[PDB]
Amino acid sequence: MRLLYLHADRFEYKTVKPALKNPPDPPGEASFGEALVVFTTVEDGDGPQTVMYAASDIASHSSRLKVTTVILYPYAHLSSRLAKPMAAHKRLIELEGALRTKFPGHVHRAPFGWAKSFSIACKGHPLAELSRSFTE
Amino acid sequence: MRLLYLHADRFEYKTVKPALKNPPDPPGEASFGEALVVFTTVEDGDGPQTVMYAASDIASHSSRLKVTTVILYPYAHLSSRLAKPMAAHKRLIELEGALRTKFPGHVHRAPFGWAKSFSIACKGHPLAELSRSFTE
Numbered sequence: 662m663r664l665l666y667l668h669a670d671r672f673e674y675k676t677v678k679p680a681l682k683n684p685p686d687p688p689g690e691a692s693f694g695e696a697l698v699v700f701t702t703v704e705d706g707d708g709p710q711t712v713m714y715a716a717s718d719i720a721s722h723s724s725r726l727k728v729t730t731v732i733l734y735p736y737a738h739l740s741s742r743l744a745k746p747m748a749a750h751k752r753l754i755e756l757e758g759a760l761r762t763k764f765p766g767h768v769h770r771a772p773f774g775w776a777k778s779f780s781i782a783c784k785g786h787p788l789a790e791l792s793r794s795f796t797e
Numbered sequence: 798m799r800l801l802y803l804h805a806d807r808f809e810y811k812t813v814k815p816a817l818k819n820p821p822d823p824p825g826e827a828s829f830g831e832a833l834v835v836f837t838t839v840e841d842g843d844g845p846q847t848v849m850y851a852a853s854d855i856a857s858h859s860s861r862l863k864v865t866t867v868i869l870y871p872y873a874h875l876s877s878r879l880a881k882p883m884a885a886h887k888r889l890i891e892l893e894g895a896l897r898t899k900f901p902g903h904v905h906r907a908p909f910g911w912a913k914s915f916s917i918a919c920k921g922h923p924l925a926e927l928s929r930s931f932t933e
């Protein structure tokens with residue numbers, strides 16, 4: 662699993678056209694104030710262990726940043742070892758649930774498999790932009 | 798070399814605090830209308846060949862998108878095989894020059910080694926977000 666952590670002043674996205682056949686999530690759109698935006702690429706052989714490590718790390722980083730909102734944003738582009746879409750969707754769902762056990766604020770998982778426009782205003786402090794890798 | 802191609806409606810950045818010791822570029826800030834934003838991670842053993850492949854690909858993608866502005870945005874986070882900063886700066890400079898030989902519009906290389914805030918409004922069409930890897 663490869664993550665990009667962007668500490669945002671604001672974030673918004675809107676689903677456009679699908680990028681699968683039947684995307685597994687409904688279309689939709691959402692916008693946020695200050696949040697940690699976590700661009701999330703599920704990799705082959707990401708499993709339950711990987712999910713728990715990533716959840717714990719997002720929680721711990723969020724805690725030090727003092728953010729109360731985390732966006733889990735499915736993203737195909739951070740890796741060249743992708744999990745298949747069906748598995749990736751499932752791991753993203755589990756990540757979202759595992760995060761709620763570890764982090765007390767708002768957790769929003771964006772729709773999987775839709776093309777989306779988005780807008781972010783990313784902070785420029787030293788911890789505002791970080792990458793993480795998790796394996797098992 | 799690992800690239801992320803974001804086809805933006807608008808992009809802006811502002812340098813905040815440095816992230817090296819003496820950053821090699823001056824501080825500053827800039828904003829743009831529609832552009833291809835190319836987040837660029839220089840990897841160990843990126844050389845002149847790599848630069849020319851990447852330049853040609855950015856040019857060709859830009860051409861099909863019909864964009865007339867390319868932002869080369871130094872980015873440390875897309876890879877786990879980074880080139881050292883001094884080499885990375887040099888390759889980024891060469892990429893910028895090699896791009897001008899291949900693409901006829903505005904080329905802007907953002908300051909290397911500064912922390913920066915930024916804002917992007919990224920399009921949601923099917924080619925708006927792509928990743929590339931180049932080696933030699």
Ligand SMILES: Nc1ncnc2c1ncn2[C@@H]1O[C@H](CO)[C@@H](NC(=O)[C@@H](N)CO)[C@H]1O
Nearest residue numbers: 680702703735736737743744749773774926
């Ligand atoms: N292994 C994986 N990890 C995370 N997300 C994945 C995935 N495989 C498929 N996706 C999702 O399907 C859309 C098209 O591939 C993907 N869409 C996107 O990545 C857009 N935001 C940018 O192109 C994404 O929703």
Ligand SMILES: Nc1ncnc2c1ncn2[C@@H]1O[C@H](CO)[C@@H](NC(=O)[C@@H](N)CO)[C@H]1O
Nearest residue numbers: 790816838839871872873879880885909910
């Ligand atoms: N191998 C490499 N490829 C591309 N850029 C590189 C680099 N090594 C160092 N940098 C630059 O130094 C800043 C801190 O590492 C980096 N700053 C950034 O990556 C911020 N935009 C986000 O943290 C970047 O300017």
